[PDB]
Coordinates of C-alpha atoms (C1' of nucleotides) in Angstrom, one line a residue:
Chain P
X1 CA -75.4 -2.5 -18.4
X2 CA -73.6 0.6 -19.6
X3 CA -73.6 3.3 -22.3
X4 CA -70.1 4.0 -24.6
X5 CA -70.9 7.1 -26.5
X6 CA -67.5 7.0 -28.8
X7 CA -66.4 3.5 -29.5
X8 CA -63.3 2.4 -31.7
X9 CA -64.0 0.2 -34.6
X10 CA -61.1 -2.5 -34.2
X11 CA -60.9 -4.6 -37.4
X12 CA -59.5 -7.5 -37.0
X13 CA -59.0 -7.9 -40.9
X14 CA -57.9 -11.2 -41.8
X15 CA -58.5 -12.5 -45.4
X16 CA -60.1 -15.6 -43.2
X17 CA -62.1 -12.5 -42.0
X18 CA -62.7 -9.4 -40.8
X19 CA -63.5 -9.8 -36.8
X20 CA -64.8 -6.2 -36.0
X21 CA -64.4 -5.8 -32.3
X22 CA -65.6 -2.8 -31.4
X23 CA -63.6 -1.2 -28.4
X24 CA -64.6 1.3 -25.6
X25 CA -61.8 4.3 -25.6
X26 CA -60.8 2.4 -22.4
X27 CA -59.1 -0.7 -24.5
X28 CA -62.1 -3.0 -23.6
X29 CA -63.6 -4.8 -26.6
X30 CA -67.2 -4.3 -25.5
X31 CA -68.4 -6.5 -28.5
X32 CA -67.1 -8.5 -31.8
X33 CA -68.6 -9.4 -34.3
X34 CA -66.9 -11.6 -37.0
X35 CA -67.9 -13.1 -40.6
X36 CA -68.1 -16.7 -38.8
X37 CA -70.5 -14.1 -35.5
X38 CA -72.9 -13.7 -38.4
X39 CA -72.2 -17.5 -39.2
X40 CA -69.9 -17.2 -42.3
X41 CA -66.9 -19.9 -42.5
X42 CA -64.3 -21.7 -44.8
X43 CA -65.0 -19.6 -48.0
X44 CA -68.0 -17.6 -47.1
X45 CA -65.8 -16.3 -43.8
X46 CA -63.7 -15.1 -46.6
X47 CA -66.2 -13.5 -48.5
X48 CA -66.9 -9.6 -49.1
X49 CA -70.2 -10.2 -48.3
X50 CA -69.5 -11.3 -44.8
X51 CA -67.4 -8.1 -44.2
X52 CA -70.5 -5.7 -44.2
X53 CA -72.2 -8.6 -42.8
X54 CA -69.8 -8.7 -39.3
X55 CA -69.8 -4.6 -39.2
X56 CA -72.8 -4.6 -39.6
X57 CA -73.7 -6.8 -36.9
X58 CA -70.9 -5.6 -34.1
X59 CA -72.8 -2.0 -35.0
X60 CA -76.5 -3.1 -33.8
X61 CA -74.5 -4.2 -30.9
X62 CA -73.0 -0.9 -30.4
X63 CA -76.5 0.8 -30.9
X64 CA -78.1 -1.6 -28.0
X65 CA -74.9 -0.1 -26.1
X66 CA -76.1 2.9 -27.3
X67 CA -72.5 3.6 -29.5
X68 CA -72.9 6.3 -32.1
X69 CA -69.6 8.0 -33.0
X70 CA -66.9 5.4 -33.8
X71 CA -63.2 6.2 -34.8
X72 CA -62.6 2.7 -37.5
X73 CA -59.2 1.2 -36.1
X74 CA -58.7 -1.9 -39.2
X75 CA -56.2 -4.2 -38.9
X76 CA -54.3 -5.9 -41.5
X77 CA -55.2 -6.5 -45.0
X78 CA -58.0 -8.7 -45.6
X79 CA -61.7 -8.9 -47.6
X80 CA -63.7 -6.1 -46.7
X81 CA -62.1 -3.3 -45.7
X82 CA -64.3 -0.6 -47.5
X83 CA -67.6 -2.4 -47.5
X84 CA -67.1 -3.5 -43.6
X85 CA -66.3 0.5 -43.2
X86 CA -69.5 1.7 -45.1
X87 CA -71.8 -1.1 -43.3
X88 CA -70.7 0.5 -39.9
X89 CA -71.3 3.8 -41.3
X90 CA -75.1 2.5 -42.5
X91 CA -75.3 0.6 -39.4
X92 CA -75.2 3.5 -36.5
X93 CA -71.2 4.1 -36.6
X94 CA -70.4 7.1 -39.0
X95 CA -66.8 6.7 -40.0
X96 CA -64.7 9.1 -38.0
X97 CA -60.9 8.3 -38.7
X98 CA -59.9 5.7 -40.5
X99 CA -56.4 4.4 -39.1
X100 CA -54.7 1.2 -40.5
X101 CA -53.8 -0.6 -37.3
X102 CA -51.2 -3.3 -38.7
X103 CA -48.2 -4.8 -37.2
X104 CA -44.7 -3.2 -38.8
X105 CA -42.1 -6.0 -37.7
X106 CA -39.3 -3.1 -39.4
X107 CA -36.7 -6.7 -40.7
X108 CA -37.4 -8.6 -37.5
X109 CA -39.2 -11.6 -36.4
X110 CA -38.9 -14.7 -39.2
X111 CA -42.2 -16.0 -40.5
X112 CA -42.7 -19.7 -42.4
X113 CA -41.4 -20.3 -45.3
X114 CA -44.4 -20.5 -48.4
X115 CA -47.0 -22.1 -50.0
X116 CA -47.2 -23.2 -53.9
X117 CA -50.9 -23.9 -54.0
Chain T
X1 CA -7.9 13.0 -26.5
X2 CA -10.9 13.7 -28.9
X3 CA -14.1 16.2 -29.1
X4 CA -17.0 14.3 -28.2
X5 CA -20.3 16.0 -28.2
X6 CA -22.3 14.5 -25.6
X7 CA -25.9 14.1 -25.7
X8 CA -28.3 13.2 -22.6
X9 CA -32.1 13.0 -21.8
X10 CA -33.1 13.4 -18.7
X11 CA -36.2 12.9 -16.6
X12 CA -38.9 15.0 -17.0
X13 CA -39.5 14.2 -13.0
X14 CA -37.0 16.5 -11.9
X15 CA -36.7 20.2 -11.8
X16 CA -34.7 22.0 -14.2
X17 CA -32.8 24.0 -11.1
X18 CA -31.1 20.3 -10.1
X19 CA -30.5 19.4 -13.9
X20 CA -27.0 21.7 -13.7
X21 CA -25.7 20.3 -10.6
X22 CA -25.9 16.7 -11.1
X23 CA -24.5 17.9 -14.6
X24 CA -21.3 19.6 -13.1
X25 CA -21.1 16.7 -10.0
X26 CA -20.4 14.3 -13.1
X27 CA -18.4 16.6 -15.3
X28 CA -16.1 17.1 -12.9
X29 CA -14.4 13.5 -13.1
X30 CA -13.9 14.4 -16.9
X31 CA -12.5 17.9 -15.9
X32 CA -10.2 16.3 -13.1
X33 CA -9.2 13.7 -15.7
X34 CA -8.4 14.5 -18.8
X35 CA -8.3 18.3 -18.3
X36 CA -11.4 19.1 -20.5
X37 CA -13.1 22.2 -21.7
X38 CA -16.9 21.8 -21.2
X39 CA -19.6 23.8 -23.0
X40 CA -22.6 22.5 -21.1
X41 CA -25.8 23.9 -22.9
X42 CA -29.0 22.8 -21.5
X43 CA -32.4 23.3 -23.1
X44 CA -35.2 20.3 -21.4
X45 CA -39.2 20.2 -21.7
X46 CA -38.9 18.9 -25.5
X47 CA -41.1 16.0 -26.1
X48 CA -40.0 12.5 -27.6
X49 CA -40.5 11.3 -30.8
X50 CA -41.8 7.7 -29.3
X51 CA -42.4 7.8 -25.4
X52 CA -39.4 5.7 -23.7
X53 CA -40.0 3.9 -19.9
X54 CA -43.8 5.5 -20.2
X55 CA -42.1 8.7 -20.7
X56 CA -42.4 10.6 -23.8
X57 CA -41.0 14.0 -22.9
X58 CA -37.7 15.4 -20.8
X59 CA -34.9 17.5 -20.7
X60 CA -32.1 17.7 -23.5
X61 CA -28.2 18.2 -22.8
X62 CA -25.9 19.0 -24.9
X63 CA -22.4 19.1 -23.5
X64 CA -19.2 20.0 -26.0
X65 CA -16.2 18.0 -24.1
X66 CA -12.5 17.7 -25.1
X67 CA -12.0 14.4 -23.3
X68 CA -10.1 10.8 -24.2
X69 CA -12.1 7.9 -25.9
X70 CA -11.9 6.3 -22.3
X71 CA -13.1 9.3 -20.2
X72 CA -16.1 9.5 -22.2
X73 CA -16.3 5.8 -22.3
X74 CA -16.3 6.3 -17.9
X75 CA -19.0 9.1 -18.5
X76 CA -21.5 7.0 -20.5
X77 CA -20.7 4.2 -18.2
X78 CA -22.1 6.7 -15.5
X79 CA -24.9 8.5 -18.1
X80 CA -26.8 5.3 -17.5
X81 CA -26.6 4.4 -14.0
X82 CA -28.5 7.2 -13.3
X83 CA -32.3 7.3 -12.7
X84 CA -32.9 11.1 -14.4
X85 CA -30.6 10.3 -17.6
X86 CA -32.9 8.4 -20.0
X87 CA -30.4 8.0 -23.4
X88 CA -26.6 8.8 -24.0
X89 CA -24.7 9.1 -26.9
X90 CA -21.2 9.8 -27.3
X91 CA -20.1 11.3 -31.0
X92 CA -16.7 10.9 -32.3
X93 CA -16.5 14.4 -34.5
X94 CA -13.8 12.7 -36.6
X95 CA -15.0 11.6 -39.9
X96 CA -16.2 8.2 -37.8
Chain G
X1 CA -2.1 4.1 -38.7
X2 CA 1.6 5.6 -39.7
X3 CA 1.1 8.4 -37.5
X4 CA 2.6 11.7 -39.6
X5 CA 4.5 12.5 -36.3
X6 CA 6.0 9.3 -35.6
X7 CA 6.7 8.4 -39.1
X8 CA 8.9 11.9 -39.1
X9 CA 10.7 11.3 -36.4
X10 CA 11.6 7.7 -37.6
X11 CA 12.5 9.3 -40.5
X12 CA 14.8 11.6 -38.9
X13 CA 16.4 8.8 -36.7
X14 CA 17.2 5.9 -39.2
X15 CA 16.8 7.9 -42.5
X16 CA 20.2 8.1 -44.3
X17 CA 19.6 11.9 -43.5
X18 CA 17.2 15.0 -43.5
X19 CA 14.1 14.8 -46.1
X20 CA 15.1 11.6 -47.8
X21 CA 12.0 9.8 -47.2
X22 CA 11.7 6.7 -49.6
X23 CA 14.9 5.5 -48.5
X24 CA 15.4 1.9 -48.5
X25 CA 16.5 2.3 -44.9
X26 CA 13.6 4.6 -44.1
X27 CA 11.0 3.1 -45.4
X28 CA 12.0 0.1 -44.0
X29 CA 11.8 1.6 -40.7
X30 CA 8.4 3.1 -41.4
X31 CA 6.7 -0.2 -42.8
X32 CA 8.5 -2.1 -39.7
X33 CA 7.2 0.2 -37.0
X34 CA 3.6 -0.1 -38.9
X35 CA 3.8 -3.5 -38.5
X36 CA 4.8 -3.4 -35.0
X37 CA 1.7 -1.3 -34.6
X38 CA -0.6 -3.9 -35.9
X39 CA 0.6 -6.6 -34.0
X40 CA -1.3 -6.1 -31.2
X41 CA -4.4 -4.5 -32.9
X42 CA -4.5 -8.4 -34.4
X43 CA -4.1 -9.6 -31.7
X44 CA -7.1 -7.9 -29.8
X45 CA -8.8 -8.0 -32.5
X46 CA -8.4 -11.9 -33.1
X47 CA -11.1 -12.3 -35.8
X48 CA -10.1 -9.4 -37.9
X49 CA -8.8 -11.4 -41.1
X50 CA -9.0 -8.6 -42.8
X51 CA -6.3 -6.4 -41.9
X52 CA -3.7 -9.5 -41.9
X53 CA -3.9 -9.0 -46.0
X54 CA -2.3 -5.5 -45.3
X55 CA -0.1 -7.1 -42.8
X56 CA 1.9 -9.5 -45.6
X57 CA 1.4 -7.1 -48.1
X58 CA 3.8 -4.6 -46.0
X59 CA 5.9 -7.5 -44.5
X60 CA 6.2 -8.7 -48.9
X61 CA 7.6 -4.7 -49.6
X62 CA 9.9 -5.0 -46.9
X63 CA 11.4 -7.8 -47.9
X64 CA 11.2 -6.7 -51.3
X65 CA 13.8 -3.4 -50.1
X66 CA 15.6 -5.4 -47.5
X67 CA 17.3 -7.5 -50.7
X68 CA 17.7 -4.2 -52.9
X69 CA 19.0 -2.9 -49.9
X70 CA 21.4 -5.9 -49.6
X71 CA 22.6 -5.6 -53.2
X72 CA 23.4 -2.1 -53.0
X73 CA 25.9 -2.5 -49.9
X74 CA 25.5 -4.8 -47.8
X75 CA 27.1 -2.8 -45.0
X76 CA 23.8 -0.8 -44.5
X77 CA 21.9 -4.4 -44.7
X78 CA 24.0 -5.7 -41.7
X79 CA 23.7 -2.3 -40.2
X80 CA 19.8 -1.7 -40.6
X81 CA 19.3 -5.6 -39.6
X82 CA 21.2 -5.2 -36.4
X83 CA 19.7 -1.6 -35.4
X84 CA 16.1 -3.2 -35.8
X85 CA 16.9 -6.7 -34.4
X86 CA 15.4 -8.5 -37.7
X87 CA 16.3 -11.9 -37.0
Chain V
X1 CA -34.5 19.1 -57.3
X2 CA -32.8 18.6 -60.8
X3 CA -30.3 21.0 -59.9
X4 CA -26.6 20.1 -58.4
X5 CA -27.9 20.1 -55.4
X6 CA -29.4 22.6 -52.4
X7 CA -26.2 21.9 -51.0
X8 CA -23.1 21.6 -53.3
X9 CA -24.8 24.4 -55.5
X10 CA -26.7 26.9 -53.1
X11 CA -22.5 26.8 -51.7
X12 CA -23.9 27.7 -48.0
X13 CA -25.9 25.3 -45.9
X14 CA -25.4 22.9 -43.3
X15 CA -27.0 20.3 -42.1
X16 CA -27.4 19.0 -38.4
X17 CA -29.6 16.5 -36.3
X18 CA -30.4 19.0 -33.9
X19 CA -32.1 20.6 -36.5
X20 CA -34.9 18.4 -36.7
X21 CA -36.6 21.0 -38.5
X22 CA -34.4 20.9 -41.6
X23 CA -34.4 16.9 -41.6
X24 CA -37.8 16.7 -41.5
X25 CA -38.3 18.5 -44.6
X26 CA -36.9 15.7 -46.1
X27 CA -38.7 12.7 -44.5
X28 CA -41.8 11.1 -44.7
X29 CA -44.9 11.8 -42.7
X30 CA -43.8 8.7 -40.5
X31 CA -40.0 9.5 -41.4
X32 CA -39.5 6.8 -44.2
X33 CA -36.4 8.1 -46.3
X34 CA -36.3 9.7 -49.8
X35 CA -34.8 7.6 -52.5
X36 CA -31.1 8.3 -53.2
X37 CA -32.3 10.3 -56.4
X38 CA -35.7 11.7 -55.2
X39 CA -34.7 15.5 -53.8
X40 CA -32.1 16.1 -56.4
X41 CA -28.9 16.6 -54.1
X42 CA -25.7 15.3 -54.4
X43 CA -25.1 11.9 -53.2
X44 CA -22.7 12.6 -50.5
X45 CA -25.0 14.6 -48.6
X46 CA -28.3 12.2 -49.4
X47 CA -25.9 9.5 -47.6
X48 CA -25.0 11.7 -44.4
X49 CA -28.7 13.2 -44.1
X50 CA -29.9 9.1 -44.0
X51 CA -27.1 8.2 -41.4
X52 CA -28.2 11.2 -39.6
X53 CA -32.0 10.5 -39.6
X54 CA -30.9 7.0 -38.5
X55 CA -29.4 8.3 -35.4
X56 CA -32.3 10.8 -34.9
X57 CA -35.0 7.7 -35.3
X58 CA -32.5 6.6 -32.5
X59 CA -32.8 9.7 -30.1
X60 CA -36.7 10.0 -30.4
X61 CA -36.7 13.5 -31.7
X62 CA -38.3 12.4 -35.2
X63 CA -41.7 10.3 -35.8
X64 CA -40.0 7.2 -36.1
Chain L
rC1 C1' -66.2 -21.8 -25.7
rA2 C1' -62.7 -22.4 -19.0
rG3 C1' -62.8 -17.2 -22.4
rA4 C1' -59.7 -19.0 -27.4
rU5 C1' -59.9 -14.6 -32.0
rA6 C1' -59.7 -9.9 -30.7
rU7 C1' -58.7 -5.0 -27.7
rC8 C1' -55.6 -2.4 -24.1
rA9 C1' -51.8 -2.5 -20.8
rG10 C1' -47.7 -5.1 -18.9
rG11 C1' -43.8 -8.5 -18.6
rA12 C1' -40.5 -12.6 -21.0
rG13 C1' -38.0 -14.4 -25.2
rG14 C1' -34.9 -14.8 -29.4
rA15 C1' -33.6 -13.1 -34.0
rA16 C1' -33.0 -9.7 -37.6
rC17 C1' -32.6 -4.4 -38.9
rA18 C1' -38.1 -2.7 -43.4
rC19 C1' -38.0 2.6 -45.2
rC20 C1' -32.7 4.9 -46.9
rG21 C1' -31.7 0.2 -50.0
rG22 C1' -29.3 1.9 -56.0
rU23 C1' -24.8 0.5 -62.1
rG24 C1' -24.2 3.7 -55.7
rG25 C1' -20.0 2.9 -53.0
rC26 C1' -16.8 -0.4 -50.3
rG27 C1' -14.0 -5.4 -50.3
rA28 C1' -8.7 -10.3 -53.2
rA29 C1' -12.8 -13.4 -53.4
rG30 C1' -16.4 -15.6 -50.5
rG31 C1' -19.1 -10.7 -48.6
rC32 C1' -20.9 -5.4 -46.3
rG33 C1' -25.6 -2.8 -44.7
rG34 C1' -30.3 0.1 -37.1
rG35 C1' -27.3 3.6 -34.0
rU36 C1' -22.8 4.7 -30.7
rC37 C1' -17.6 4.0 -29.2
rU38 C1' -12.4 1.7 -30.0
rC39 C1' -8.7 -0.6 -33.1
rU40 C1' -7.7 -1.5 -37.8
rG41 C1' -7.9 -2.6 -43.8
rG42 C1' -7.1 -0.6 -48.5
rG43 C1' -7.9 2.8 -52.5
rC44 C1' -8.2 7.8 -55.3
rA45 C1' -6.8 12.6 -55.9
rG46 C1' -2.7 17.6 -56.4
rU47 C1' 4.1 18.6 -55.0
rA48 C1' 8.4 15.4 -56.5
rA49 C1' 9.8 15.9 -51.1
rC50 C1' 12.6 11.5 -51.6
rU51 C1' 14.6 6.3 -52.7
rG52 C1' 17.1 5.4 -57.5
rA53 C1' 14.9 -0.3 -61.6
rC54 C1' 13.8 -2.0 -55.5
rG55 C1' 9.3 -4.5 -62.2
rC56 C1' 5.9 -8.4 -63.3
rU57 C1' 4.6 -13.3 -63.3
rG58 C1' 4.7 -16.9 -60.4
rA59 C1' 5.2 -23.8 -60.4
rG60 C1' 6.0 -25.9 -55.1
rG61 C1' 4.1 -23.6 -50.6
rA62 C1' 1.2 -20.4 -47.6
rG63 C1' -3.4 -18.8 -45.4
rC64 C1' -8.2 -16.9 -46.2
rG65 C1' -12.3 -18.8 -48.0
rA66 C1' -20.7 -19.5 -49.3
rA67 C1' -23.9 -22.8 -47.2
rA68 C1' -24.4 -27.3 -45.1
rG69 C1' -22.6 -31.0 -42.0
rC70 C1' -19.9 -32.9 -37.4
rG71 C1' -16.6 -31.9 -32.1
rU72 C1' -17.2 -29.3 -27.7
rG73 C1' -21.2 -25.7 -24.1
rG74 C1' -25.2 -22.6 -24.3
rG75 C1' -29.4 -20.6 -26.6
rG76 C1' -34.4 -21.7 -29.3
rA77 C1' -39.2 -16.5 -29.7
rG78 C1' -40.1 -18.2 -34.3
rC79 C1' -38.9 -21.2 -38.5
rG80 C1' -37.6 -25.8 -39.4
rA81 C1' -35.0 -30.7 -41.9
rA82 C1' -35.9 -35.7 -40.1
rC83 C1' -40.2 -37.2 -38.0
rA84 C1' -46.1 -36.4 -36.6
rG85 C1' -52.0 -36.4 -38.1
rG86 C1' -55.4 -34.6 -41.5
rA87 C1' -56.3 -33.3 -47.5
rU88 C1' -56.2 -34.3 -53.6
rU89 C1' -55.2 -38.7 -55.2
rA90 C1' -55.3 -45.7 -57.1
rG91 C1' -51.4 -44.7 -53.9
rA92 C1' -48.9 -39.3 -50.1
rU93 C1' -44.6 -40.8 -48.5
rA94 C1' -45.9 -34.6 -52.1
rC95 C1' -47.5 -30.3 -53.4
rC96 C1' -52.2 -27.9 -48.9
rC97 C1' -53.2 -27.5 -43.8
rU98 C1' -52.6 -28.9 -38.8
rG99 C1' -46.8 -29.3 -35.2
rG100 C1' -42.2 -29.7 -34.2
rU101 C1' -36.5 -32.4 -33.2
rA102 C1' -31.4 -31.3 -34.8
rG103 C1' -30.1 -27.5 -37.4
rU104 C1' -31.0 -22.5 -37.9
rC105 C1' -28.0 -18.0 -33.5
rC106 C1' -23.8 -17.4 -30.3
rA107 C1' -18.3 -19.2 -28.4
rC108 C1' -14.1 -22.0 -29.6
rG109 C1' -13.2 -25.6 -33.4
rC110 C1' -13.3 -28.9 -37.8
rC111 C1' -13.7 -29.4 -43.4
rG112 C1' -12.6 -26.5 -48.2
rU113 C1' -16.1 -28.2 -51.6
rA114 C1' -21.0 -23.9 -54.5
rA115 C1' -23.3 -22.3 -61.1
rA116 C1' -16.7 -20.0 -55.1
rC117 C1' -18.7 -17.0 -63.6
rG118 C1' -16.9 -10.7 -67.1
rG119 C1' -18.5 -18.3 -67.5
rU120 C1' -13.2 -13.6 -70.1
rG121 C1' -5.7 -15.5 -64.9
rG122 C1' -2.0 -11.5 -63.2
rG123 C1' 0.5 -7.3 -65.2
rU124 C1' 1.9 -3.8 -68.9
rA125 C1' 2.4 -0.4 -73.8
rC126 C1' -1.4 1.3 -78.4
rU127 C1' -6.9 1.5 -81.2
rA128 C1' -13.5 6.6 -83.4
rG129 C1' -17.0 8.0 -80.5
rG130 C1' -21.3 8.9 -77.7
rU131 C1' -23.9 8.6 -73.3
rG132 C1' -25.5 7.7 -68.3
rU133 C1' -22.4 7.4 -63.2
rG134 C1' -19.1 7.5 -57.8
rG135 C1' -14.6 10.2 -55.7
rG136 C1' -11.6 14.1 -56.5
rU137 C1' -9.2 18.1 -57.8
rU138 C1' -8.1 22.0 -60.9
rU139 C1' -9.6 25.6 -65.6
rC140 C1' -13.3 28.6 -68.0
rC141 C1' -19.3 31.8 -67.4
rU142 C1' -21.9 34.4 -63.5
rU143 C1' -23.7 28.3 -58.5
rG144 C1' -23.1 28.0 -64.5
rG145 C1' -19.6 25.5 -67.9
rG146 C1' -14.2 22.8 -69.0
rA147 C1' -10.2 19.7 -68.1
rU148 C1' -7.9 16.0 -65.6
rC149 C1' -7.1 11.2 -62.6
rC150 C1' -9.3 7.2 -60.4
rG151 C1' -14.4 3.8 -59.9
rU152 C1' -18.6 2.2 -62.4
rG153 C1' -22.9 1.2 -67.0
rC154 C1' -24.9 1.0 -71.9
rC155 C1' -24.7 1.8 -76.9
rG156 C1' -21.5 2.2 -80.6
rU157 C1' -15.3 2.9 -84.5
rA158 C1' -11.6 0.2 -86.2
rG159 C1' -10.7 -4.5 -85.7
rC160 C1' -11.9 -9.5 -84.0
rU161 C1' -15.5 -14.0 -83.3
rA162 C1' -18.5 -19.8 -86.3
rA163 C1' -22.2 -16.8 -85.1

RNA sequence: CAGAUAUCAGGAGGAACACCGGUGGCGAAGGCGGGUCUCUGGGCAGUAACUGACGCUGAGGAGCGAAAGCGUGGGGAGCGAACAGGAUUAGAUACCCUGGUAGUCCACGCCGUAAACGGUGGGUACUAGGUGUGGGUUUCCUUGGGAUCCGUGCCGUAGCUAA
């Protein structure tokens, strides 16, 4: 395989869920781990729980790449942005930086409309 | 005729020796033209705020011209057809 | 706009004399020149429907001298509406 | 703040875009813009110093 | 599952300009906000320099005039009517998801209706205040304060309203 000694902790941060991809300083995502990758979906993908759960997971990976220091890179809002941060910091991954990697369309693009349920 | 104060980034390829005569070889159409006093102050190797064609430094011109809406209008025409110039803009020091 | 050179020497060419700025005559002159002016700026700038309120506005004052003008004497009416070519 | 202003009651200062310096004491980390209220200047010079940070976002010279 | 999500880089696309962005301005009203340039609109302020009542209203009439919609040719990244499956439900056609056509954008046009409302027509002379607040100028401390004229809020006199 390889080694990655300082990896990048890309959260993908969806309230569906929070697909931590962890990424060589290259741009590669060596590994993901999401809340469905520990098998959470519908509700439970959704759910805090399955936050620490994916980080968690995604950092064993990055330990059995042998990944120790990790800058966190989260995306958007979504459930688990603390608890996914302090289960990669239990799991291998001490925090770093934490940077808040979300798209700023500055008035651009048009989105749909709504819901009402 | 008005006093536009033209500023121009250019390439960070070059070397600052050239950045006067291509400065002058363009100027001179403006001189020639509408007869205008130029203050050409120069200071390059400043950074970018956001890197531009995978560029994110160069060199900075200022250049103080007494020139006509339409020979400044010719210039920026010109201050873009250029591979070293990177962004123009022309300033109306009216109250525009 | 009135340019404060052009307007002056309109003044001093169709005024009734020196410094009487406000004359019927000359601001006649002043307002008609202005209107010349943005005759073409309309029509480059076809869309602008916003500076054709101005437009009647000015035309409206004209008017609005060229019959007090005609009351006064209207010797200087036939006069003024000859020099300028109004109709 | 709270006073006048630094501008139209300190009676001498300028302010340029060149002077990225003196704008930036006045923008946000990433350059967001101060409320019209927030720095306590008069309004005439809030309005210029936005129009001029505007242009500066423009010329990459100021984070953006 | 083919490498989808993702990550980086790149290219394409089309649309709009977050922060500034608010009794704050501008505009006859619909409306106006990324930056540059050009043309242009109107207002306010101090000098009467001047014209010497050239004032106002304004039926007919005039154009402008939100959005939609249609005519003509493009655009379409996205959204998205209409129309598609799935979902609650007795029924979905509806709320929800899974897409997308005209339209939505542009150019030239049409129409003229919106809750196109200070729900307060245009204009003008008088009637306690107080307080925010934009532009100006002046006058009074050593910027400080006052006056004035114009914009723009709220409260509160007289007085008015059925309240």
């Amino acid at each position: 395989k390889k080694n990655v000694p300082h990896g990048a902790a890309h959260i993908k941060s969806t309230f569906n869920n929070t697909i931590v991809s962890i990424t060589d300083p290259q741009g590669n995502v060596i590994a993901w781990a999401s809340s469905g990758h520990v098998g959470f979906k519908g509700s439970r993908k959704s759910t805090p729980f399955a936050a620490q759960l994916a980080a968690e997971n995604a950092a064993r990976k990055a330990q059995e790449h042998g990944v120790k220091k990790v800058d966190v890179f989260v995306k958007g809002p979504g459930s688990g942005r603390e608890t996914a941060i302090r289960s990669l910091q239990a799991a291998g991954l001490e925090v770093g930086t934490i940077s808040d990697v979300t798209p700023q369309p500055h008035n651009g693009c048009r989105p749909p409309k709504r819901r009402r349920v | 005729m008005r006093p536009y104060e033209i500023m121009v980034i250019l390439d960070p390829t070059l070397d600052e020796r050239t950045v006067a005569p291509s400065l002058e070889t363009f100027l001179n159409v403006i001189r020639k033209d509408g007869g205008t006093v130029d203050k050409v102050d120069i200071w390059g190797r400043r950074r970018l705020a956001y890197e531009i064609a995978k560029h994110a430094e160069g060199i900075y011109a200022v250049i103080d011209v007494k020139a006509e809406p339409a020979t400044v209008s010719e210039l920026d025409r010109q201050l873009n057809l250029n591979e070293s110039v990177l962004r123009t803009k022309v300033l109306r020091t009216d109250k525009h | 706009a009135l340019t404060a050179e052009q307007k002056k020497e309109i003044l001093g060419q169709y005024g009734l004399h020196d410094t009487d700025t406000g004359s019927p005559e000359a601001q006649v002159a002043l307002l008609t020149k202005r209107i010349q002016d943005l005759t073409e700026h309309l029509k480059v700038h076809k869309h602008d429907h916003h500076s054709r309120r101005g437009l009647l506005l000015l035309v409206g004052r004209r008017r609005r001298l060229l019959k007090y003008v005609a009351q006064v004497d209207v010797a200087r009416y036939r006069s003024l509406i000859e020099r300028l070519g109004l109709r | 703040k709270t006073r006048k202003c630094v501008f139209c009651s300190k009676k001498g200062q300028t302010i340029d875009y060149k002077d990225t310096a003196l704008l930036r004491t006045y923008i946000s980390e990433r350059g967001k813009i101060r409320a019209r209220r927030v720095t306590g200047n008069c309004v005439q010079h809030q309005r210029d110093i936005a129009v001029a940070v505007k242009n500066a976002r423009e010329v990459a010279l100021l984070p953006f």
